[PDB]
Amino acid sequence: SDQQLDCALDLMRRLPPQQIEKNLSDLIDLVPSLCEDLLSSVDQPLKIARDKVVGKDYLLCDYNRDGDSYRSPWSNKYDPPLEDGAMPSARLRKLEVEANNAFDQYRDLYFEGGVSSVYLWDLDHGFAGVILIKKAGDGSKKIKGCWDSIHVVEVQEKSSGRTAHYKLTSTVMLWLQTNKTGSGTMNLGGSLTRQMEKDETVSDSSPHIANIGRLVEDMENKIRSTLNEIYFGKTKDIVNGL
Amino acid sequence: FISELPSEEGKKLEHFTKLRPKRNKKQQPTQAA
Amino acid sequence: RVSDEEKVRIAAKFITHAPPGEFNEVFNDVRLLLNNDNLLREGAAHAFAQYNMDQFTPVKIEGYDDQVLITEHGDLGNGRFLDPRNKISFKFDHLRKEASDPQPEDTESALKQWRDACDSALRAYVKDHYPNGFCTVYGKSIDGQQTIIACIESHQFQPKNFWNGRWRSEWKFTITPPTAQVAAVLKIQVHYYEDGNVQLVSHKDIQDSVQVSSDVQTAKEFIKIIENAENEYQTAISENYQTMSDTTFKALRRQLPVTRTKIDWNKILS
Numbered sequence: 006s007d008q009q010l011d012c013a014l015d016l017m018r019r020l021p022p023q024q025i026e027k028n029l030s031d032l033i034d035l036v037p038s039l040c041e042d043l044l045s046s047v048d049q050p051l052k053i054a055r056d057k058v059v060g061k062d063y064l065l066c067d068y069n070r071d072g073d074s075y076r077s078p079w080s081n082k083y084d085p086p087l088e089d090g091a092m093p094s095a096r097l098r099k100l101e102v103e104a105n106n107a108f109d110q111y112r113d114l115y116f117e118g119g120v121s122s123v124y125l126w127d128l129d130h131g132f133a134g135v136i137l138i139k140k141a142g143d144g145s146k147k148i149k150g151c152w153d154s155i156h157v158v159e160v161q162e163k164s165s166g167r168t169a170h171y172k173l174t175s176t177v178m179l180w181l182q183t184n185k186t187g188s189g190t191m192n193l194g195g196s197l198t199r200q201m202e203k204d205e206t207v208s209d210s211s212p213h214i215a216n217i218g219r220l221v222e223d224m225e226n227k228i229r230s231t232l233n234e235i236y237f238g239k240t241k242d243i244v245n246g247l
Numbered sequence: 248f249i250s251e252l253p254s255e256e257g258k259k260l261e262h263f264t265k266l267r268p269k270r271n272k273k274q275q276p277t278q279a280a
Numbered sequence: 281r282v283s284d285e286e287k288v289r290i291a292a293k294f295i296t297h298a299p300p301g302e303f304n305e306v307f308n309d310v311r312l313l314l315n316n317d318n319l320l321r322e323g324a325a326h327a328f329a330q331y332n333m334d335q336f337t338p339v340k341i342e343g344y345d346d347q348v349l350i351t352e353h354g355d356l357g358n359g360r361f362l363d364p365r366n367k368i369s370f371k372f373d374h375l376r377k378e379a380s381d382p383q384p385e386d387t388e389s390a391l392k393q394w395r396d397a398c399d400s401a402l403r404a405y406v407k408d409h410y411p412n413g414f415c416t417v418y419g420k421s422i423d424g425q426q427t428i429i430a431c432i433e434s435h436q437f438q439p440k441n442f443w444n445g446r447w448r449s450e451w452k453f454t455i456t457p458p459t460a461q462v463a464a465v466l467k468i469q470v471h472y473y474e475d476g477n478v479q480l481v482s483h484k485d486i487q488d489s490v491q492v493s494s495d496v497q498t499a500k501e502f503i504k505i506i507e508n509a510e511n512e513y514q515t516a517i518s519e520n521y522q523t524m525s526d527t528t529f530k531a532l533r534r535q536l537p538v539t540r541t542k543i544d545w546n547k548i549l550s
């Protein structure tokens with residue numbers, strides 16, 4: 006059943022990414038016992054929702070889900086409401102608020118639009134989090150694009166509290182397509198995933214969000230370049246060679 | 248047939264998202280979608 | 281819970297959406313996930329054949345130099361496929377993708393005369409225009425209409441480098457003096473999957489017309505429309521790439537903030 010999981014993940018690597026959601030629901034229908042592991046390890050295009058009590062948008066993924074409800078980072082409330090849904094510890098909720106605000110600014114500075122959300126969760130000897138960013142380009146032109154960032158970070162604090170080990174797994178999904186359908190339609194879409202690890206000083210001048218901010222920024226700057234090379238260089242040279 | 252078919256890829260694909268930290272839910276989904 | 285019947289429908293559908301050069305990987309994945317070989321064999325036998333016909337799978341037959349495409353147009357029933365150029369029939373194992381038991385097939389029609397001229401002109405076209413191309417030309421009556429069907433395939437498989445690509449085009453010439461209407465579909469698919477999963481999917485429909493004269497003259501005109509349409513489409517894809525890279529992608533994320541410095545994370549946090 007880990008060999009089942011690997012086969013399912015191998016499947017998602019080959020099936021057209023233009024159909025991720027439908028293929029994910031089909032795959033879970035096919036192997037129901039894998040539901041939980043599939044939902045956690047299969048990245049999907051990010052969905053937008055409105056938090057009506059605060060009047061801000063937030064992003065949906067498995068990391069803010071419980072039952073069939075989603076938690077907003079602004080109001081810290083599930084929607085539809087939930088009696089008992091997973092919540093961050095009070096200390097961690099505080100950091101989650103600062104992190105949302107911080108990455109809101111990061112998004113403005115790098116994306117000049119789109120939407121971002123940050124969700125944190127407690128671990129035995131640290132904490133983890135996801136940084137989500139969704140930016141659509143001009144959808145009015147002959148060609149339109151969209152960008153989804155999914156940055157999952159795992160943080161292990163050392164006992165001294167002076168260093169921590171940071172583990173980043175980042176997915177960027179990049180979708181470009183012709184507004185025409187079908188004849189003359191062209192769709193270039195999918196995702197790349199990368200990993201970074203780093204030990205870092207943790208102090209009043211280098212707190213968690215700053216250390217995480219830098220890793221996410223480094224990662225995204227690198228992946229942007231890599232996307233450019235893969236999408237517009239590599240797939241194009243393959244086409245040229247057909 | 249039916250039997251596992253050959254591959255020229257040489258190596259398994261690695262699945263980086265497998266190694267991501269897990270968040271525990273209080274309840275599992277009704278539907279995936 | 282989904283019924284076993286549904287489970288195979290899903291397994292079958294996955295198999296039909298396998299990217300080019302990755303049928304075996306998708307089959308093995310789905311075979312293991314289903315975990316019922318008897319069910320896979322009954323319920324997804326249709327899908328193996330459909331995948332091969334939709335993909336224009338090229339196959340080498342022992343004792344003939346030119347590979348033949350497996351298409352719906354060559355399906356002769358009970359596991360056999362036509363090779364119109366070589367005037368044979370052959371069993372095809374859809375899973376192993378192997379041709380066996382070649383046998384002579386009568387053709388004769390002589391829509392055959394047109395068929396042979398179109399085939400000659402297309403063969404020369406394909407050798408020039410594709411690095412590793414194959415083509416198959418069919419001549420038959422559908423709804424009492426004499427129709428030429430030209431199929432082209434060209435692929436590059438680099439599984440060791442985690443990518444695969446394929447071009448397909450199907451051209452239908454419906455013979456009606458003096459003007460034959462022409463219909464086509466051109467398709468591209470490219471899959472890159474090192475540390476990700478990126479795919480190009482694209483197709484284009486063509487409608488046009490050819491004046492019909494002699495078999496040899498008309499064929500040459502046929503090929504002229506193919507070349508032009510296939511060239512224009514390649515040019516458009518390449519224009520689309522250029523637009524995507526210098527406009528569309530740039531509109532998503534900047535390289536640096538407007539201040540063109542990396543972020544001061546202390547200032548953000550205060």
